[PDB]
Amino acid sequence: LISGKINKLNDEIKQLQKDFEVEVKEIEIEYSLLSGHINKYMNEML
Amino acid sequence: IEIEKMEKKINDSNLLMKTKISDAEELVTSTELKLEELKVDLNRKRYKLHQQVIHVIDITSKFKINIQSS
Secondary structure, eight states: OIIIIIHHHHHHHHHHHHHHHHHHHHHHHHHHHHHHHHHHHHHHTO | OHHHHHHHHHHHHHHHHHHHHHHHHHHHHHHHHHHHHHHHHHHHHHHHHHHHHHHHHHHHHHHHHHHHHO
């Protein structure tokens, strides 16, 4: 239970949190890239 | 009195057995339920982040349409 099931579940929780953090970071990278594209779109108005 | 004192010890040990087994099973079930709830919450957060990305794309499209129509 402790060294097994409970520890395995805790490790799975940590891995799921890490995967969620990676996905959130990728989504925020896309967000920042789109924002930079829009800022450049201001320059492309000229 | 020695016999009954150690019999009370035995009864306490059996009650502790039942309590320990119940607590261990409850801990395992609670950890599993917490994992499932965290999975659901993170899926919802991912969906909300995708919706936010869609909202930003919609904002960009609306701004482009407004500028081009002007």
